[PDB]
Amino acid sequence: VEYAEYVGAVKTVASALQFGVDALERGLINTVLSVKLRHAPPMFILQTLA
């Protein structure tokens, strides 16, 4: 019964760790999308300036 408690606790901690690196990876995509949108002028200016 203590072993069944222990494997559940290590599953929770491993879930939190894998959640942490997964949330960090999703944040990397979010930062990439934000920095590409920051250097993005709209369509109706670069349709003409190009």
Add this chain to the structure above:
Amino acid sequence: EADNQIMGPSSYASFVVRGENLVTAVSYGRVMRTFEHFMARIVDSPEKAG
């Protein structure tokens, strides 16, 4: 005295939540004593006059 000592047990008769009880421990919180006795009663020959 007709006797000077009585032949009694030496250790506690152990009982821990083993494998087949543990599923009911985690899923229900309902552990029974001697799950093997219940499985020998109401699964293998429930016709057995107790």
